[PDB]
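Components:
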Amino acid sequence: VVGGTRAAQGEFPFMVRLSMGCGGALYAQDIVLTAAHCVSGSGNNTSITATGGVVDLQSSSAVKVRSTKVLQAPGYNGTGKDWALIKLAQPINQPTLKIATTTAYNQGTFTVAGWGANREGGSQQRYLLKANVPFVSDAACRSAYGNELVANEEICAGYPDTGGVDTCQGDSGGPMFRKDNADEWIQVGIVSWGYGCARPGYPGVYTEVSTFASAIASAARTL
Ligand SMILES: [Ca+2]
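Structure:
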């Protein structure tokens, strides 16, 4: 995260750090929702480690759990559908993050979090960082990215005019979320891509969770 601040321990307990340099959210205690580009494909896989329970990755209180299987969005090829599920060998006993099933919350100011770089070319972070990024319309986002932006599969956020606050290398897969009508966090995006980080005119692009919610839920029932 570029232009963020340290998240308090226990603030976003659904966050998990993934071994390949990605973030993720606890969709279920033993199912991590992350980005399709964080994994190589679907299948049995015990090589991924998810670290949960702590903002400080060096904490002795960290819970490190290995994966058992990965389900990457069917048909993923780098043009949208940027979601994936990772089944864990054991559950991480922390609150989960509900995903948006409608587009009612695809607006307003969102919150993002991760252990990714806090500057372009920077190193990964020991402590979880968070930031608030405003929703950016498809039109404004398209003025920057043109056809690279996938209509109805991607939502953008950040400051189009002046930049300064954004997700960056290492934050991919993390959830982008906001409060729902019941004062509970709800996931509207998955950190996906962007040109650089926090640059004026280039907002961050996120997987539009509402579009994939039914697919994600069905896929999770099979793990
Ligand atoms: Ca959209």
